[PDB]
């Protein structure tokens, strides 16, 4: 049985770029219901696993991946965003987004374009492609894990769902990009290169 | 080119079900990206066809089905709510409610269920199959019709899309059903029975 | 771990519909590749669901799909066909098909279209929705079993897989229908009415 | 209006690797079929375009796509493959293959794996990420083209489908791609990527 992941930081330290309200309600609310639909499937899924139902696994097959990929995309979620974070990653990792994709402002903007082309619910995903050992953009509707259906290692993670921003920037989602910026938290996504390239 | 449909009610009709903001942000932002969007959608995808690149009218086959389904969804959103709507259907079409679903207060919980189950973004649909002649329940994500995707001719509604509740219920989408229930305006369902039965 | 259901008739029982070849080569082939795959796949994700990894379980949901789906679905063809199964059903379906389709031959038309409808590789389907408590036409793509992925219970079952009739048909599945409907085990069919119906 | 494509080389060109039957049978009638429907779907499509009914077009997309997508893949399954083609590639583009998967036999393990990965019916292809201005691997199911859908440029397509394969190598599509690998049209790939790349 899964857990709900505490925040490392409190609801109100995003300000202004994502007001207290938005952290408060996602967090206790849409992702507690994700872990605890997450937490429901396994057990019927689990027992119908044991008994050997094949027909019962693929009937369950929809709602464990939904509720799976949200806990796993929102516990990514909530370590890639930092209060003190933002502004110009440093390291390897900057040199790694200037080889694959010229510079970092040009990273930005793709990652952004990719983020706003979610038709509907969605998430906009940085991630190594191990196999090929290069940074790469995807999009994945609903809450499709990365590494589950892709296979891309997931670094940094945002999400467009119409609750992650609705409350504050109501329709125009490239404010809530261009806010969302201000609070990424590249220290955390260098750990997660370092751990995924090694 | 298509243009934007004037609601047949003000903004603050819907009080207080749906309050004035959801109404206006709805109507003027979404709906209105939407038909623009189509529009450069359509300019787009014929002179592509015209050109004859079936390559271009695959890549813009997405785009196009979003945007056209999203105005269709809208359209037929907005006449079937009514400040004055809501309560018992009357006539032909609660006696087809009754046979197809046993009771009106069936068919009512079969909907929410229906609604609620969309996992994202996406509409739940009242629809008469025309083919085998009777009522049926249909869930579509995203903004995909009812009628262009799966043949249902659309008679009832429901946007469980977040930006249609968010700002007022927040999470809690059951409450939104049980408040939406209460601003359907079963006259125009009824005439569009009566068209599609015929 | 799951096991190859021995066909109840020998291999040249259809002629001269389904020639020995192809029922051959289907059921010691492409049905045991499904049921090793599926055993193999049940395996890794049994392991993987003990090891508690939801990453890994989204991963393998579509192998597990692919192959269950491929193992319940051809087990119920192998029963769904008889050498002296064909003709006209009788009892009670035959008077629910009666009621769903108008006659017999119009259903007979109604699945073959389904059939021939299918986009590559897939299934035909007639199944009992219990909920609504009549007969359906559906087509699922791919191995996609029909109570698993629909709900419908599955009373008939059509392969319009490739490799159910190239050997013999060649490219025109019309012909392949027509000659399957000589085949049907309407007994068969009959019994998962009844079980079903209840 | 579209035609069919003449084949550069006789049916039998391809022996004993694809025998002339299994040409023969998809050129003459699986790609004949594609591009009549694809005509019709046009027409139905562009009157439906004039008269501005997005429901109509919205439903004719599937149609559209296959058809058209199936012309397209076949059209360039046709030139990827010459009697005199197979070994090894020479110029800048095994220089690519080189530095983007470590060596030819790396690309043919890779593509081989993805191909018989297409469960169901498919295509594998070996495309150019322009964007990225790299060669990559992808797996496309039914008809779905590689430029339309991904928008990677395709260079090199096997057709996983089953009436590529199915009347000489039966189920083992192993074989098949190993005997495939022979007659695949270097020079054509070459010239694609030269056209591409530019
Ligand atoms: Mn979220
Ligand atoms: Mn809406
Ligand atoms: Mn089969
Ligand atoms: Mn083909």
Not at 26 to 35: D, F, G, L, P, T
């Amino acid at each position: 049985k899964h857990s709900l992941p505490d925040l490392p930081y409190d609801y109100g330290a995003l300000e202004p770029h994502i007001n207290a309200q938005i952290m408060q309600l996602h967090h206790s609310k849409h992702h507690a219901a994700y872990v605890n639909n997450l937490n429901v499937t396994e057990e019927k899924y689990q027992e119908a696993l044991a008994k050997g139902d094949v027909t019962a696994q693929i009937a369950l097959q929809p709602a464990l991946k939904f509720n799976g990929g949200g806990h796993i995309n929102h516990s990514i979620f909530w370590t890639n965003l930092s209060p003190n974070g933002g502004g110009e990653p440093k390291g390897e990792l900057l040199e790694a987004i200037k080889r694959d994709f010229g510079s970092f402002d040009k990273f930005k903007e793709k990652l952004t374009a990719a983020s706003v082309g979610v038709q509907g619910s969605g998430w906009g995903w940085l991630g190594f492609n191990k196999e090929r050992g290069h940074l790469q953009i995807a999009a994945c509707p609903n809450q499709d894990p990365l590494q589950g259906t892709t296979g891309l290692i997931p670094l940094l993670g945002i999400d467009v769902w119409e609750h992650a921003y609705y409350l504050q920037y109501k329709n125009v989602r490239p404010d809530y990009l261009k806010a969302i910026w201000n609070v990424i938290n590249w220290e955390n996504v260098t750990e997660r290169y370092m751990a995924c390239k090694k």
